[PDB]
Amino acid sequence: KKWIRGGTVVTAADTYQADVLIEGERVVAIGHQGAEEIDATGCYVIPGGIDPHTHLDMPFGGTVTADDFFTGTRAAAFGGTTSIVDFCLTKKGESLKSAIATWHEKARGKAVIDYGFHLMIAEANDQVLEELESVISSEGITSLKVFMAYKNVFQADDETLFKTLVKAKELGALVQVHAENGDVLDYLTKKALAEGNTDPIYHAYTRPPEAEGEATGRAIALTALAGSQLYVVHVSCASAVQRIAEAREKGWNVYGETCPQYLALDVSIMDQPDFEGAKYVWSPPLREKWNQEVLWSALKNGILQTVGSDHCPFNFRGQKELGRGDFTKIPNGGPLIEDRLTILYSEGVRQGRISLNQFVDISSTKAAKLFGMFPRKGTIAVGSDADIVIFDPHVKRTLSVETHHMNVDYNPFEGMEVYGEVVSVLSRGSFVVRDKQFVGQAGSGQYIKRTTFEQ
Numbered sequence: 001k002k003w004i005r006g007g008t009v010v011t012a013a014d015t016y017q018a019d020v021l022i023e024g025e026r027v028v029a030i031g032h033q034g035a036e037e038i039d040a041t042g043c044y045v046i047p048g049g050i051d052p053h054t055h056l057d058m059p060f061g062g063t064v065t066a067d068d069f070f071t072g073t074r075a076a077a078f079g080g081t082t083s084i085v086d087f088c089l090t091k092k093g094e095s096l097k098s099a100i101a102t103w104h105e106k107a108r109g110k111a112v113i114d115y116g117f118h119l120m121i122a123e124a125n126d127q128v129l130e131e132l133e134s135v136i137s138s139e140g141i142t143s144l145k146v147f148m149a150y151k152n153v154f155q156a157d158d159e160t161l162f163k164t165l166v167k168a169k170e171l172g173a174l175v176q177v178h179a180e181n182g183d184v185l186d187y188l189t190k191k192a193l194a195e196g197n198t199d200p201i202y203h204a205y206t207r208p209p210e211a212e213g214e215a216t217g218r219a220i221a222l223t224a225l226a227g228s229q230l231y232v233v234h235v236s237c238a239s240a241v242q243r244i245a246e247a248r249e250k251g252w253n254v255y256g257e258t259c260p261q262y263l264a265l266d267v268s269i270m271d272q273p274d275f276e277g278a279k280y281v282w283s284p285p286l287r288e289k290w291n292q293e294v295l296w297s298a299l300k301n302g303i304l305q306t307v308g309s310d311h312c313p314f315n316f317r318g319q320k321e322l323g324r325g326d327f328t329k330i331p332n333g334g335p336l337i338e339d340r341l342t343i344l345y346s347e348g349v350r351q352g353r354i355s356l357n358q359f360v361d362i363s364s365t366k367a368a369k370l371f372g373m374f375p376r377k378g379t380i381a382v383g384s385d386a387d388i389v390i391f392d393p394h395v396k397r398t399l400s401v402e403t404h405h406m407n408v409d410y411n412p413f414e415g416m417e418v419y420g421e422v423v424s425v426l427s428r429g430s431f432v433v434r435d436k437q438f439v440g441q442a443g444s445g446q447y448i449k450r451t452t453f454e455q
């Protein structure tokens with residue numbers, strides 16, 4: 001039993017001062033007036049963050065992401081994130097269960113926090129459609145990802161997208177899409193290389209906002225025609241939110257997600273002398289700064305509901321470096337898993353962009369609800385897992401590769417002044433991080449079976 005006292009509990013809806021009693025792996029009592037004491041005076045007691053978008057230990061050519069399920073979850077913990085949902089990638093001629101078994105082996109005995117899996121659908125043939133019933137019912141995976149981009153690699157066509165959408169409505173699954181028109185980007189990419197435009201900045205220029213807008217709109221119309229439910233991952237521009245906002249007005253089950261990088265960074269940082277811009281190469285690419293306001297406005301008024309990181313790190317030296325000759329050879333992705341919460345609090349709450357309660361809803365609660373992990377995770381209430389973060393809102397610090405915990409040689413926020421510091425982190429009643437010190441253990445984290453889609 002653990003007794004957190006003196007702190008101010010903050011959830012998606014409430015804000016009060018009281019003690020929370022933990023017994024075993026869960027919260028068993030909350031209130032005022034024989035247990036492990038933990039002082040949380042002057043700090044916020046919030047639900048551990050939930051990052052529904054990660055790519056830990058992901059392969060890419062002959063190299064792999066700098067972080068694996070161990071260093072990745074440890075960094076996630078230090079950042080105040082207690083649960084993650086990683087993307088299990090599949091390959092045509094795909095046996096969904098073999099890919100799934102592959103992912104469990106990646107996490108098994110390494111994760112320090114709880115994790116769930118999303119399942120990529122490369123193609124929707126009779127076989128895949130049949131297997132799908134077992135994955136949703138037995139494997140606890142109720143979210144499927146379809147790529148509308150990355151031609152000749154992962155891209156799926158409208159037939160695959162639509163079939164998946166009706167199947168998901170039938171089985172109670174949530175469909176996620178990476179929305180960028182794969183074909184227009186493929187054409188623009190080759191063209192840029194033919195004209196000798198090989199600098200990292202052309203990565204951004206070869207995939208215009210409208211390409212994300214078009215794809216976002218298409219996926220939504222297909223969702224409507226199928227009467228299903230859709231979740232658009234990493235929305236980066238005004239063009240895409242506009243389409244999402246429109247569908248929401250019509251009462252369609254369409255949800256959206258953003259990431260720290262699109263909220264606090266912009267394309268102008270890609271235009272740098274040497275090969276510096278390669279540090280910010282990820283898809284979708286950073287956009288013009290005006291788009292940040294639109295995203296923040298959408299999060300404030302409920303147009304977008306979640307915030308993930310899309311953590312997919314590669315060192316600048318030794319990995320990002322493969323693309324020196326041309327941007328298409330630069331492995332995509334950034335080290336974003338650790339600073340998601342803090343920038344959300346510092347740039348969002350402290351600057352009056354969103355309320356403290358929304359802060360919790362956007363970084364934990366809503367993701368738990370959309371991906372079937374609630375009320376086990378995503379809140380502080382009797383019966384829920386004791387996944388708690390003791391956050392110090394009065395701390396001022398600078399984000400730096402010098403002090404971060406991700407196993408990568410750089411931080412995309414290098415030098416950014418922020419408010420807020422994660423002090424202690426509990427995962428199912430056990431300390432993973434205590435007083436800024438790591439006390440967890442590899443393999444402590446567990447797989448979470450997710451329930452079917454619920455509005």
Ligand SMILES: [Mn+2]
Binds near residue numbers: 178233283
């Ligand atoms: Mn993506």
Ligand SMILES: [Mn+2]
Binds near residue numbers: 053055310
């Ligand atoms: Mn991703």
